[PDB]
Design a protein around this ligand. Structure first.
Ligand SMILES: *[C@@H]1O[C@H](CO)[C@@H](O)[C@H](O)[C@H]1NC(C)=O
Ligand SMILES: *[C@@H]1O[C@H](CO)[C@@H](O)[C@H](O)[C@H]1NC(C)=O
Ligand SMILES: *[C@@H]1O[C@H](CO)[C@@H](O)[C@H](O)[C@H]1NC(C)=O
Ligand SMILES: *[C@@H]1O[C@H](CO)[C@@H](O)[C@H](O)[C@H]1NC(C)=O
Ligand SMILES: *[C@@H]1O[C@H](CO)[C@@H](O)[C@H](O)[C@H]1NC(C)=O
Lengths: 109, 126, 450, 136, 450, 125, 450, 124
């Protein structure tokens, strides 16, 4: 049972958008260990938000993440052309397993 | 026959009197086991010297058997010679005179000092 | 009439006390394999005994006011303490422990007597720590609130029993300095007091083995042709009773479980010797005593015992009165592992006064021990890899008499022996120390030449 | 920092196959590993996770009893046993690393059994992946 | 005509230096409370003194070159530190302290003399720590730039006094070994140096109490019929002036604060005795001396000073010139609590050509001290629970001069405590050590017989 | 009369001659542990130094031992009565203190030849 | 006819072993500065000690089975440990080091021999950490996998050497007690074993400087009129060969680097002395020996060395056969700085059938020192400010013959430092300790008086 | 002056007149206790030799003879060959084995002498 995500999200350059990911109290509401990944065709995904509200080195400062109870979201500010792609949300589970989301398609108008 | 160290303790006083040398030879000899043993070695040396000095000041410096010029106070013990040297032993003899050893020791000390004065006064012109 | 005469070197002596010095046999004085009691410093002993028999002499002895046992006690403590200084102290081991039961191949008896504890320990570097695990006996840990801690951590730190020093009870001889002598009472019926008809002087004593135990005397000296019962005041219930067997009864002890020693690096040059894993089945330790011989021995003890308390009295035996583990159990160590055996099966019978049964005694084991019944002092005995078993030599008992008045025709004796001096008092009862007095004055007809 | 996979091919339904991965540039003996399979137009699906020493394993419910995860620190390789494949199993499998490190606490660095790493619960380095398809 | 004769045991001695062993009474030895000074190891004293009066003999004495004080200085310091080795070391107390002023019951004179500091502390288990607080005097804490730290942290690891061992002085007797003798000077008018017409010999000196104090000699031996003034060189200002009262003057010191002790379990088996909330009013410590009596004794002191410095000069007393609290104040201890009293009120008067106010001396209190002026050697005194009040009487003074720029009409004397040995010359001034020379050769008309 | 240890220190030399014995008995009799062990050993060696010195002079067990060597007038020319009746031991030692070492050598050689003369005399004469 | 007599004080002696005690000169006994070899506790001795020649006396001497050298080895080692007890232990220094190669003005051959390391270290406050840096030699650190670790951290913790004490080998005099005498072999051609025709007795030995060196004896005693060789068994190649030069050859060792010390306060009242930036240029430490003099010395060593192998044999010298750096290089210290020099340039030549140029020996430096072939005992030598130059004698040489060929016309010799006892025996070969036997009995015609 | 032990080369008879000098020299924490035990050993060793001398009846003498004869087995050499050429060093090895036995004869004679003396004077 993968986490629920919006099928597609769109936004013109210069706008701010948010991608929503929802799970359950067993996985999303149990721990702050939730991750977001960015993927492009022909290459494996890369992690952008490894903790709930933190990012690794080398990624732009525009990214932002947040959590609220049984839901979590990823925010990108100042949309640019290269931001187009696919994104996935991951979260730890109560029984030490990892669960991915359905995925979201990001389109830059 | 040979009795050994303290082997004449039960023997009569007269017989034990000839075995004095064996006792005398044994009064001295040549980390928890450190100062514990050293403390013992020093005790024997100082203890042995005290007996020698006390014996020395009585004029009996180097003799195992020696007699002095101080009378045997009959009050100390009236027991006859035949009932001391031939039937008895030293172990109970010490008990009888234990009341009077201190008095006897002092009398010997004063007598010898007089002898030293007499010898000097005699050979000076006689 | 009579004239004072002084004799030097006369055979006279008196009661005294001195600092006796050790003497060791050639075997223990030359092997030099780091015996805990430090016989390397102890002087090598005489080639053979120089016993001299004193005829016609009668001397009085008292084994309960003997200062020899008091000096031996102090020496043992100093040797034990002085052997723990140079090796590691387990102060970092006082940390929270996450422990769980071991249930791999547990036998029914040892359901929960072993705990599998894991903890964070300091590695070679002072800024990094590594998770490690060890097996601990149930008696050596206590709950904090799973979470556990060692029993000692709230009392004092523990010094690990150093791995090269050995606890084998090798013999030692206490020899007196010059000017003193040791008198041995050779009477066979002399219990602990009174004149000794036959007395002899020795250069010093025979090899006394410092075997440490409770309620039982092991690897000791035997009596002659009779069982000897000795007590300071037999009529007093508060005084212990020392029994001595003329014929020994063998007891076999073992630790069946097979374990591997494991080293944990707690610091630079310092290692903690943990218990890695158990190999094969896990079975409780125990000791075996021949039922036929032990029952025979108790039939001889009662024979001599009934004399003091009346030939018409009923004699009954019962197990310990309870309390601390160290007292209620027969403590000892086989090899280098300390045992605490339940002797409730030995002392259970009643006497009316007219070949492989192998009474077994379950035994528990500890690694954190308060050896000398002190407070604030500790030692940790590391595990011994492989199984261990040994055959022992019972030669006495430390009994205490439960107080029942003549309003009862019954004498309830139970094991005792809390004080550790009585263990060595059983062997030092023959010996006494005296001071030689070579100065004496006697009368005779003797003048000086002048 | 590069995980190389292999073992792609075409097999019939119900066949058995093995996926092999190799690691280099980092201490493979300290960090756990993941297997992730992706299909055209389908979201990422997790397969299994294995502890740094293999003492603990976890398998997704969707593939329980059909796929297993194993590793050999002596060879710096990661393995996944494909048993009784079916039509839905076709996908590209990625050999992934579990990002982790010492747990900072009380000013000290705490490492697991045998100096192992604790899990930070995210993936950092991914292999190029391998593809397997099932056809009649 | 004349020939030599050698005599053994003649009464001849010469000045010599040797180590004197210890002799003490049975009070501390029997109680076995383990005073800070090893009186238990000190040999038991003789039943009574064995004084002999030596007639017609005069001996030269010199208290300033006496070695008995130097050995006493070494022995007492060595004993003081030996009592600190066993008990715990407060190395982990060096951390950041969050201190705030206490204000619950503070008096104006003691507005900010102590702090209420909270700090993080270790506990029995090494992986855990405890948050605790304690009351520290302002003299023991220093601002980092609020955050405070103990004064000793940037000096050395700092040990605490062990509560069980007491600090009260116990008389100690010094006895010479065989072949040596101690001569006592019984001349009532004996000043610091000079021949003593009346001489006596003893084997052991009278009980000397190791009282440690500055600017005032407490619980000392008193002079007879006159106040005595002694100095190595009166005309040299660099030499301290010792005064000995013929009659004593009493001083009452107290610590009215009723504070509570609070033990903190640091590490395994160790404990830190902090100070809890104070009960009742918070008031500074003080000492009382009767004004009428203090002026009376100073009049007798001035009379003797007139003899040496002219019987027409002006004698003036002034407080300490300046320095740190250790020397500029009257240091001492009362019931295990160390004091530092402001003696400005005593030495404030002028004497020219010739109502019980009970002068009160405010005193500070300190926890961390350097008793022997050594650097890096602590003794942190644990708090004493309850109220302290001890009574002692002064028996002398230590004074120093200043000025004297050819204006020989006014004199100033000020307290001095630079050297600790000066507290002990006042007791050993009458003793000296000599060694016997039994060999002697004299002429006499005597020749050997052969 | 008994005056005690060092009692006759200030008395005349003649009186002190009979007082020798009372002083001869006093020549011999962990901070406080090592400090005590040192004292005991020091007394023994000091006492033996006099005994060995007093022995090689032919005065082993004698408190007063006349020796057959002359009294050089350079050491002291005072009257015999003046010395033994009008002075004390402390005064006497302080006077001949310089020349004491010289006498010790004379005592040793005199006894060395006395023993040899005795040995070679009784053998044949 | 003849009768047994007894003579006391006869001049007889027997071989014996005893603990000789130390003595010191006035200059060394009053320097007032601490040193490894206790200036205190060594009884001062008067100059020109009495020397008595024993005419007509021939005595057996031995330098191999000599007890004097054995005692000196233990005495020196015992003093070293006693001189490190109060110094600070460097246990906290065991942490990860982040190091980079120092590069300021490094020369080509010194590239990579110094590491500039930084680490987190404790401070006086237990709740705070400080970041510091230091320079370490490559021999002192190892890589964890840049991350570096001190070499000793996995074996033991080293104790910093106290700067107050000094390592200068002042002379030491070994003097026997009463009842024993030391016999010196006055013979000027003695070969260390066999009878010594001329012997003398001395109060005790001359000053022996405890110089520690390998492959070479420095500051030693010179041979008399000829280079002389010692060996327990020349036929056995395993035994080392000791060569003593009759004339010295000078060596000049220096550390050109201008080091700067930097104290780091790692604890309360204890600091670690680190190395700061090197002032100026960084260069290699080296030693200088004149080529002309060294060739002359070898030309004389070969001459005498050829006597033991045949006038027609060829003598060849080669460098050490490798192994631990402590034994395969000429180790010593120069003003507190330890050196390890590669002497391959000295022993490199062949001798067949028979001025400013100098030999430069590159020299390495280390701070983790054992020097006693011990495991777990290590010491850290703190840096010493400024440049250093010490010029020393070379008075000896230790060689080890080698060769597996059953029969050959060439013999190869290599340098080797077997044990420190070789250094001592080079000085103690001249002395022998014996025990006096004063009692003796001889016959003559002498009957007692009676 | 031959000094201490300087007479070892002098013949046996020549060393007899210089016995006094050698008698004086019999008796006279790493370095601390090492010095202490040395002093103790010297004392007891000196007493040991003195005790044997005392029980033989030669307490206060350096040269002393006893009432027990010599044995030709111990030495067959003449008096001139003993006291004129060799030194004490050679003598000790010559009669080394017989020293223990001779000490027994000397020891018993003194006790016998005292026993006779004490009884003889009383009778006469
Ligand atoms: C562990 O053992 C204890 C004592 O035998 C028992 O109370 C507890 O239930 C056991 N727990 C498990 C998980 O076996
Ligand atoms: C008690 O019974 C025993 C049995 O052996 C006997 O020897 C003894 O004489 C009896 N004593 C009395 C007082 O009856
Ligand atoms: C605390 O005491 C100090 C020193 O007396 C003073 O400077 C400060 O103002 C005080 N602060 C408070 C809040 O009482
Ligand atoms: C000094 O004055 C005092 C006044 O009391 C007097 O007693 C004393 O005799 C005087 N001394 C001299 C030397 O004038
Ligand atoms: C010494 O060397 C010469 C060289 O000619 C030779 O003839 C002679 O035999 C040698 N002597 C010995 C003893 O080797």
């Amino acid at each position: 049972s993968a986490l629920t995500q919006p099928a597609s999200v769109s936004g013109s350059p210069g706008q701010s958008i948010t991608i929503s990911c929802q799970g359950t109290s067993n996985d999303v509401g149990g721990y702050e260990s939730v991750s977001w990944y960015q993927q492009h065709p022909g290459k494996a995904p890369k992690v952008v938000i490894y903790d709930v509200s933190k990012r690794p080195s080398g990624v732009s400062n525009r990214f932002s993440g947040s959590k609220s109870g049984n839901t979590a979201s990823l925010t990108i500010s100042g949309l640019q052309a290269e931001d187009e792609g696919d994104y996935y949300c991951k979260s730890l589970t109560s029984r030490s397993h990892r669960v991915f989301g359905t995925g979201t398609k990001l389109t830059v108008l | 026959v040979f009795l050994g160290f303290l082997g004449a303790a039960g023997s009569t006083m007269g017989a034990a009197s000839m075995t004095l040398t064996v006792q005398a030879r044994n009064l001295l000899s040549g980390t928890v086991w450190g100062i514990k043993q050293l403390q013992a070695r020093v005790l024997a040396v100082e203890r042995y010297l005290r007996d020698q000095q006390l014996l020395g000041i009585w004029g009996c410096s180097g003799k195992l058997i020696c007699c002095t010029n101080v009378p045997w106070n009959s009050s100390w013990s009236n027991r006859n010679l035949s009932e001391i040297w031939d039937n008895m032993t030293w172990l109970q003899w010490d008990k009888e005179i234990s009341n009077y050893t201190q008095i006897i020791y002092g009398l010997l000390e004063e007598s010898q000092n007089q002898q030293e004065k007499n010898e000097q006064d005699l050979l000076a012109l006689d | 009439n009579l004239w004072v005469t002084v004799y030097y070197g006369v055979p006279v002596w008196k009661d005294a006390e001195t600092t006796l010095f050790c003497a060791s046999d050639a075997k223990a004085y030359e092997t030099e394999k780091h015996n805990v009691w430090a016989t390397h410093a102890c002087v090598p002993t005489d080639p053979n005994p120089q016993e001299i028999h004193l005829e016609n002499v009668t001397e009085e002895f008292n084994m309960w006011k003997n200062n020899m046992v008091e000096q031996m006690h102090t020496d043992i403590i100093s040797l034990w303490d002085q052997s723990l200084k140079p090796c590691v102290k387990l102060t970092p081991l006082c940390v929270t422990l996450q422990c769980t039961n071991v249930t791999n191949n547990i036998t029914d008896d040892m359901r929960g007597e072993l705990k599998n504890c894991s903890f964070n320990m300091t590695t070679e570097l002072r800024d990094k720590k590594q998770k490690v695990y060890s097996l601990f006996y149930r008696l050596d840990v206590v709950q904090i609130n799973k979470e556990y801690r060692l029993i000692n951590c709230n009392t004092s730190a523990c010094t690990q029993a150093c791995p090269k020093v050995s606890f084998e009870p090798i013999p030692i001889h206490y020899c007196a300095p010059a000017g003193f002598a040791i008198l041995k009472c050779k009477d066979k019926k002399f219990n602990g007091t009174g004149p000794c008809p036959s007395v002899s002087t020795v250069q010093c004593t025979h090899g006394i083995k410092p075997v440490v135990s409770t309620q039982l005397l092991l690897n000791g000296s035997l009596a002659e042709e009779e069982v000897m019962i000795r007590s300071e005041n037999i009529t007093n219930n508060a005084k212990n009773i020392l029994v001595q067997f003329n014929t020994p009864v063998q007891i076999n002890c073992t630790r069946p479980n097979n374990n591997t020693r494991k080293s944990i690096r707690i610091g630079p040059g310092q290692a903690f010797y943990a218990t890695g894993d158990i190999i094969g089945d896990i079975r409780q330790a125990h000791c075996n005593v021949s039922k036929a011989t032990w029952n025979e021995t108790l039939g001889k003890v009662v024979k001599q015992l009934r004399k003091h308390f009346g030939n018409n009295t009923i004699i009954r035996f019962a197990n310990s009165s309870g309390g601390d583990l160290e007292v209620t159990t027969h403590s000892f160590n086989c090899g280098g592992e300390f045992f605490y055996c339940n002797t409730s099966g030995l002392f259970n019978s009643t006497w009316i006064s007219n070949s492989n049964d192998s009474i077994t005694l379950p035994c528990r084991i500890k690694q954190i021990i308060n050896m000398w019944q002190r407070i604030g002092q500790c030692m940790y005995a590391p595990p011994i890899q492989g199984v261990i078993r040994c055959v022992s030599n019972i030669t006495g008992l430390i009994l205490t008499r439960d107080g029942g008045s003549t309003n009862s025709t019954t004498e309830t004796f139970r094991p005792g022996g809390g004080d550790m001096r009585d263990n060595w008092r059983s062997e030092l009862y023959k010996y006494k120390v005296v001071k030689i007095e070579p100065l004496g004055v006697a009368p005779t007809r003797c003048k000086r030449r002048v | 920092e590069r995980l190389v996979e292999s073992g792609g091919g075409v097999v019939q339904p119900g066949s058995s196959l093995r996926l092999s991965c190799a690691a280099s540039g980092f201490d493979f003996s300290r960090q756990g590993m993941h297997w992730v399979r992706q299909a055209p137009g389908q979201g990422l699906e997790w397969v299994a996770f294995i502890k740094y020493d293999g003492s603990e394993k976890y398998h997704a419910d969707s593939v329980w009893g059909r796929l297993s995860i194993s590793r050999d620190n002596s060879k710096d390789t990661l393995y996944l046993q494909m048993n009784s494949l079916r039509v839905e199993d076709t996908a590209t499998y990625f050999c992934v690393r579990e990002a982790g490190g010492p747990d900072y606490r009380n000013g000290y660095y705490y490492y697991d059994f045998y100096d192992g790493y604790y899990n930070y619960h995210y993936m950092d380095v991914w292999g190029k992946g391998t593809t397997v398809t099932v056809s009649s």
